[PDB]
Design a protein around this ligand. Structure first.
Ligand SMILES: Nc1nc2c(ncn2[C@@H]2O[C@H](COP(=O)(O)OP(=O)(O)OP(=O)(O)O)[C@@H](O)[C@H]2O)c(=O)[nH]1
Ligand SMILES: COc1cccc(Nc2cc(Nc3cccc(NC(=O)C4CC4)c3)ncn2)c1
Ligand SMILES: Nc1nc2c(ncn2[C@@H]2O[C@H](COP(=O)(O)OP(=O)(O)O)[C@@H](O)[C@H]2O)c(=O)[nH]1
Ligand SMILES: [Ca+2]
Ligand SMILES: [Cl-]
Ligand SMILES: [Mg+2]
Ligand SMILES: [Mg+2]
Lengths: 346, 424, 54, 437
């Protein structure tokens, strides 16, 4: 019998993982602060990594990679991509992004020398501002920086993708969410089922603060949007519908047109940070489920916009995905008494 | 270094004599006090319990006390009865009539100073006295009443020495008189205040072990005492033999007792032996030593939590396997160990096995389930006391009903203290 | 990666590699504490002995 | 030449001291009766080894050592063992009853009555010194003597030798080899009371030494003898610069200068490689590059922790054996491109390197194979604070319930010393986090 502990009750995915583990008849849940566990399902903040791997008689595994936050918080990721030679400033799949601190190191004296060469060359010059609610999509700098300094947090400003791929019927934006599981052996597993988080407003290239055609977030779409639910149930189109639409409207598949780039981007990011976070020779072991957020443009080029270190699955998929987490992240380490993942390796 | 052993009253002397027989055999010492074993490990720490008398003869550092001469005449006549220093036999004539008051306040009071004189002569002849042990019952009058009087006098005169008891608790299934709940409640009050450790030996438990698993159909006091002396040998073997642990009294006391009053221990022995042979594996030993049925206090460990545990292994076995099985016990039943005392289970090994066994184990648990024992006594006590039944045996020796009310309250207090830490 | 302060002898050598430049109480105060804890001890012992005298 | 006095306190300190002095004699060619045939200055000298040994008229070489325990049984095996003639009886100080795993008993009750005898034997060694630089103090965190009496001694030594340096070799508690449940209390109490009297402390987690002995030496249940011969290899590696000709870490002051920029963060991490079983039938000898890379595997550290998630303030590499600078610089260069080595912004990213051409000496019939080159890395990384977190957490669990506190109050300690010590430790942990994140 194996023992585990739960320290994040607000996690949908690992709530389901706890249920599955208990139903195995070979996993028992201890109280949150009992140290004699095999598996810690940790808290999201200040998880006590320094206390794992010091229990004699116990192999200990945890559902977070210490240090993965460098990929999963926006300014962390901008600094990682620009400073890592593996990724490089000359990185063809991450939008032009600058880390800017509030009025109250910083890149706005770097950001102007590029922005104004965008205005002089008579290129489109829309930028979006965000932090790890509070979004500004504008066309000139003094709206962006102004706004950033009204807030109090470190921020990034990213080149807004003005020419996105638009789904018809609708002329509406969407983002792709890919769930990736990294096991203790640092196999990278891309889950077969991604999701499209769609808009229901026709992209308005004119005034960028109708923030309902421009912002794919599952919440801003349900509340303030006109037609939440007209085209797809929950502004959630899945992969077979998308492949079929790509085949019909565009005469391509999802695999060739988008997925190759998504696998390349996921593998590149994770391999970039592998020596910093790998637990290969550590006294405890880590796994983690990441959610990757992508945007396809009109030329069918995939862009990465964020990595989330504690994602929520799509309701249709919770069962199969959490069962997969058990099968390859947990039972690989703690064996019990046609896979749903693609291994990314090259 | 030296330990001073005291045994008081009938039960105290019968179990104390069996203790001295068992460990004299283990150290190769015959009923005349002469050494006759092979190993020198038998003599390296012999002075912990024996004084070296002229002729390299070994005399137990043991004081024998009773208010009637019977049982001590029986021990002088017994198997090892001539091993004891004759001056160390201290007795009165009139007996205690199963009456705590006689043991503590009247007859006992008249004998106690002569007992302390022998204690003092034994102590001042010690280079480095670490403390005392007392064997007695709590249900009679001499062991309970005079033994606790002795305990308080010894504390007064030696406040910085360790004081341990091996205390037989009374049970109605193995019962001499109806007043045992009174004598035990009065005694437990003393013990909670003036001992460092008390090994709670429930006579019900010894009976059940003799009957259920030793298949003894009608257990005698002898049968019960064989269990007790094997257990006591177990719990003292680390003091008596060289090993990687320079085992002493104080460090067990410090490490087992997180709160001064919660020092009542549930002892156990494995494999449980009669007066059979299939050898035991280390996992088997380890499961049995934690088995409720090998414990000498009739408390369910699953009804409480372990505050601390000493696990003592005897014989030659793999330390790696011992460590694995001990960790498996704690990791597969971690609920029952309090999390606010990290790593509260410690392991000791003595290479020399007891008589007739290649491997054995001894268990010493400080568990909150021991509250059960005190609840039993308390219920028995209250059923008589609410009608003041049998009190005249005590008021005739000068005691007041108020002292009964106080001892009752104090034992209920001790029960509550254990309950506090069972839910903490 | 430049090697500085190289020193060599017959037993060995030492040097420094720079990858990148930079980006008590008294004796009386103690005797007081020790003896103060001794007073707490002799007080606790007196409480014990008066309790035994009662 | 400036002399160093070693002080070994409590069981762990004494047995580890035994191991180290045995190793020292083997490395300097000193026999168990103290004669050193290679020393041609009979009766005296100011050679590098004289930092650790004095000489008598008969040419006996005598450790500048004091052993202290509150009970006799451990030091009695020194007084009767292989190196009995090595030490002089006034150097071996024992009490009658020990501290019973109780900090307060070692510091207040039983310590107060032997502190002056110890300081006097220490002064007798200091008076033999032409230019004493200070003290190396060996002790456990967990025992009552190693914790309580060590902190009392350290306070007094600050008072009686205010200008001298004091270095600690500290054994941090591990349940696998522990016979006491109150070690977290004793650890916190002694760390709090010693923090400002220590210039630099080398912490060895018995857990790390135990698992190294199991993985690399194939010892299924390591004894103190196994742990101590490995510990003494590490200790010898750290002190070789004091005992041999060289130019790095030549006096105790330089250990602080090179390793401790911030005086409260004075706990450098030791990583040692290679550890090879003498029973290994076929061993391919490891290169400069392979052992220097092994210095960044946590499985080789003296404290299991993750230096990738913290920052370095200093880094020293001490080699023994067939090593030349170019192989070290090549190895460092390639290690820097494949490993996470981040310094604080106010320190140079760099390594001070010491090479002694003599390969490590091994005890005959010990567990360690002879190798042609070995290295001890001393890095001041904030990741060592992981150990503090572990220790503090255990302390808190017990102290929330006041479990065992009466044992300490009963020796004259006040309860408030507990939370004072713990708050010092909370400050320490926040120092580490502000420097390292
Ligand atoms: N590595 C190593 N650790 C030891 C050794 N001896 C004891 N320890 C550790 O030290 C701690 C126990 O403290 P000791 O040094 O034995 O105690 P002490 O200083 O003698 O203090 P008291 O006996 O309580 O008076 C435990 O963590 C032991 O595992 C040793 O020889 N080597
Ligand atoms: C839960 O914590 C524990 C648990 C078990 C050990 C320890 N450590 C010790 C223990 C010790 N004496 C000792 C050890 C075993 C048995 C006994 N039997 C006796 O005393 C009988 C009562 C006279 C005494 N001496 C030094 N260390 C700590
Ligand atoms: N286990 C055991 N219990 C005994 C023995 N003799 C008496 N008892 C129990 O001890 C209590 C009687 O006390 P006893 O020692 O005979 O009275 P005392 O002589 O006045 O101290 C009762 O609970 C008896 O069941 C014995 O030899 N072994
Ligand atoms: Ca010389
Ligand atoms: Cl000075
Ligand atoms: Mg009777
Ligand atoms: Mg000791």
């Amino acid at each position: 019998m194996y023992t585990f502990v739960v320290r994040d009750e607000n996690s949908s995915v690992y709530a389901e993982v706890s249920r599955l583990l208990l139903a195995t008849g070979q996993w028992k849940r201890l109280r949150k602060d009992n140290p004699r566990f095999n598996l810690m399902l940790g808290e999201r903040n200040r998880l006590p990594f320094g206390r794992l791997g010091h229990e004699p008689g116990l192999v200990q595994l945890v559902n977070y990679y210490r240090g993965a936050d460098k990929l999963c918080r926006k300014a962390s990721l901008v600094k990682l991509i620009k400073t890592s030679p593996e990724l490089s400033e000359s990185c063809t799949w991450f939008p032009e992004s600058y880390v800017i601190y509030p009025t109250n190191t910083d890149e706005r004296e770097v950001f102007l020398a590029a922005y104004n060469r965008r205005r002089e060359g008579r290129e489109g010059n829309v930028w979006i501002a965000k932090s790890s609610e509070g979004i500004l999509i504008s066309s000139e700098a003094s709206e962006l920086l102004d706004f950033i300094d009204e807030q109090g947090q470190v921020h990034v400003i990213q080149k807004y993708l003005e020419k996105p791929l638009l789904l018809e019927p609708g002329h509406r934006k969407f983002d792709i969410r890919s769930w990736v599981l990294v096991d203790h052996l640092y196999n990278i597993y891309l889950y077969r089922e991604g999701v499209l988080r769609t808009s229901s407003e026709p992209y308005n290239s004119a005034n960028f603060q109708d923030k309902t055609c421009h912002l794919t977030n599952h919440c801003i779409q349900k509340e303030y949007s006109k037609n939440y639910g007209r085209y797809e149930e929950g502004n959630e189109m899945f992969f077979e519908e998308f492949n079929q639409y790509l085949m019909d409207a565009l005469n391509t598949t999802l695999e060739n047109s988008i997925l190759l780039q998504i696998k390349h981007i996921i593998r590149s990011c994770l391999m970039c940070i592998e020596p910093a976070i790998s637990t290969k020779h550590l006294h405890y072991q880590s796994f983690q489920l990441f959610g990757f957020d992508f945007m396809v443009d009109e030329e069918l080029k995939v862009w990465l916009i964020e990595v989330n270190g504690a994602p929520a699955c799509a309701q249709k998929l919770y069962a199969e995905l959490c069962q997969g987490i058990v099968d390859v992240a947990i039972s690989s380490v703690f064996p019990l008494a046609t896979s749903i993942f693609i291994k990314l390796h090259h | 270094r030296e330990i001073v052993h005291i045994q008081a009253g009938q039960c105290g002397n019968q179990i104390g004599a069996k203790f001295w027989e068992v460990i004299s055999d283990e150290h190769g010492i015959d009923p005349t006090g002469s050494y006759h074993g092979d190993s020198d490990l038998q003599l390296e720490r012999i002075n912990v319990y024996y004084n070296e008398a002229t002729g390299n003869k070994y005399v137990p550092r043991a004081i024998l006390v009773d208010l009637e001469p019977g049982t001590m005449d029986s021990v002088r006549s017994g198997p090892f009865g001539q091993i004891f220093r004759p001056d160390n036999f201290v007795f009165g004539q009139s007996g205690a009539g199963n009456n705590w008051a006689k043991g503590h306040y009247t007859e006992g009071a008249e004998l106690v100073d002569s007992v302390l004189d022998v204690v003092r002569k034994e102590s001042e002849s010690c280079d480095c006295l670490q403390g005392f042990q007392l064997t007695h019952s709590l249900g009679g009058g001499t062991g309970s009443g005079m033994g606790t009087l002795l305990i308080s006098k010894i504390r007064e005169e030696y406040p910085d020495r360790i004081m341990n008891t091996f205390s037989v608790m009374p049970s109605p299934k193995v019962s001499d008189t109806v007043v045992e709940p009174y004598n035990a409640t009065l005694s437990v009050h003393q013990l909670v205040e003036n001992t460092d450790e008390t090994y709670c030996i429930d006579n019900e438990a010894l009976y059940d072990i003799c009957f259920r698993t030793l298949k003894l159909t009608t257990p005698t006091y002898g049968d019960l005492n064989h269990l007790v002396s094997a257990t006591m040998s177990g719990v003292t073997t680390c003091l008596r033999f060289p090993g990687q642990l320079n085992a002493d009294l104080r460090k067990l006391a410090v490490n087992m007792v997180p709160f001064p009053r919660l020092h009542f221990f549930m002892p156990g022995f494995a494999p449980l032996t009669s007066r059979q042979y299939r050898a035991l594996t280390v996992p088997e030993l380890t499961q049995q030593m934690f088995d409720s049925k090998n414990m000498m206090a009739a408390c369910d460990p699953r009804h409480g939590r372990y505050l601390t545990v000493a696990a003592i292994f005897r014989g030659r076995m793999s330390m790696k396997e011992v460590d694995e099985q001990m960790l498996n016990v704690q990791n597969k039943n971690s609920s029952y160990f309090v999390e606010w005392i990290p790593n509260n289970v410690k392991t000791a090994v003595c290479d020399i096995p007891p008589r007739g066994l290649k491997m054995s184990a001894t268990f010493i648990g400080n568990s909150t389930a021991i509250q059960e024992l005190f609840k039993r006594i308390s219920e028995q006590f209250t059923a008589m006391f609410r009608r003041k039944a049998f009190l005249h045996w005590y008021t005739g020796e000068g005691m007041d009903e108020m002292e009964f009310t106080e001892a009752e309250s104090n034992m209920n207090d001790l029960v509550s203290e254990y309950q506090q830490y069972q839910d903490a | 990666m430049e090697v500085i302060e190289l020193n060599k002898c017959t037993s060995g050598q030492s040097f420094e590699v720079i990858l990148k430049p930079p980006s008590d109480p008294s004796l009386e105060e103690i005797q007081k504490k020790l003896e103060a804890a001794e007073e707490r001890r002799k007080y606790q012992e007196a409480e014990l002995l008066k309790h035994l005298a009662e | 030449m400036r002399e160093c006095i070693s002080i070994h306190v409590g069981q762990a300190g004494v047995q580890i001291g035994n191991a180290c002095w045995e190793l020292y004699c083997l490395e300097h060619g000193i026999q168990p009766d103290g004669q050193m045939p290679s020393d041609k200055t009979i009766g005296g000298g100011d050679d590098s080894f004289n930092t650790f040994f004095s000489e008598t008229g008969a040419g006996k070489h005598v450790p500048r050592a004091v052993f202290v325990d509150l009970e006799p049984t451990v030091i009695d095996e020194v007084r009767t063992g292989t190196y009995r003639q090595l030490f002089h009886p006034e150097q071996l100080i024992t009490g009658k009853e020990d501290a019973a795993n109780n900090y307060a008993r070692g510091h207040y009750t039983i310590g107060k009555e032997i502190i002056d005898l110890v300081l006097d034997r220490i002064r007798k060694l200091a008076d033999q010194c032409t230019g004493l630089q200070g003290f190396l103090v060996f002790h456990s965190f967990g025992g009552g003597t190693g914790s309580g009496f060590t902190s009392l001694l350290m306070e007094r030594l600050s008072v009686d030798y205010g200008k001298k340096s004091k270095l600690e070799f500290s054994i941090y508690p591990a349940p696998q080899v522990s016979t006491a449940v109150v070690e977290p209390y004793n650890s916190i109490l002694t760390t709090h009371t010693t923090l400002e009297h220590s210039d630099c402390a080398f912490m060895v987690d018995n857990e790390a030494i135990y698992d190294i002995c199991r993985r690399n030496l194939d010892i299924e249940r390591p004894t103190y003898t196994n742990l101590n011969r490995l510990i003494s290899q590490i200790v010898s590696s750290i002190t070789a610069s004091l005992r041999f000709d060289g130019a790095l870490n030549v006096d105790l002051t330089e250990f602080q200068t090179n390793l401790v920029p911030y005086p409260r963060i004075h706990f450098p991490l030791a990583t040692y490689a290679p550890v090879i079983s003498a029973e290994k039938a076929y061993h391919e000898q490891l290169s400069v590059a392979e052992i220097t890379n092994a210095c960044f595997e946590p499985a080789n550290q003296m404290v299991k922790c993750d230096p990738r998630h913290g920052k370095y303030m200093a880094c020293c590499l001490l080699y023994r054996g067939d090593v030349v600078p170019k192989d070290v610089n090549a190895a460092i260069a390639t290690i820097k491109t494949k490993r996470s080595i981040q310094f604080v912004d106010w320190c140079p990213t760099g390594f001070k390197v010491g090479i002694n051409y003599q390969p490590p000496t091994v005890v005959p019939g010990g567990d360690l194979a002879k190798v042609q080159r070995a290295v001890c890395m001393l890095s001041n990384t904030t990741a060592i604070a992981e150990a503090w977190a572990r220790l503090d957490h255990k302390f808190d669990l017990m102290y929330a319930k006041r479990a065992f506190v009466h044992w300490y109050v009963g020796e004259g300690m006040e309860e408030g010393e507990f939370s004072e010590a713990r708050e010092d430790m909370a400050a320490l942990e926040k120092d580490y986090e502000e420097v390292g994140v």
